[PDB]
């Protein structure tokens, strides 16, 4: 049925965090810079409202994408 699943957002060169949110469901990505307050880097979302497929995320920060999904349906994985 409908999956949750982690939406991990992809820094340059390496995984950078996860935040565990439904399929279809949009999910928030911010950069957190010391001193700073967060930026909005992506606001994304899977693809298909019921599985998971890929992520769609808009307004995206240069390096700041998202890019897969582990942990729920991979298991076993550095997520969260």
């Known amino acids: 049925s409908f999956?949750?699943?982690n939406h991990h957002l992809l820094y340059n060169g390496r995984h950078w965090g996860t935040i565990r949110k439904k399929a279809g469901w949009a999910v928030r990505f911010y950069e957190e810079k010391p001193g700073q307050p967060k930026r909005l880097?992506?606001?994304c979302k899977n693809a298909s409202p019921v599985h998971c497929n890929y992520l769609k995320?808009?307004?995206?920060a240069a390096g700041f994408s998202a890019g897969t999904s582990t942990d729920v349906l991979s298991s076993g994985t550095v997520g969260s």
């Not at 995320?57 to 995206?60: D, E, F, M, S």
């Open 3 to 5: 999956v949750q699943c």
């Open 41 to 43: 880097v992506a606001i």
């Open 57 to 60: 995320c808009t307004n995206l």
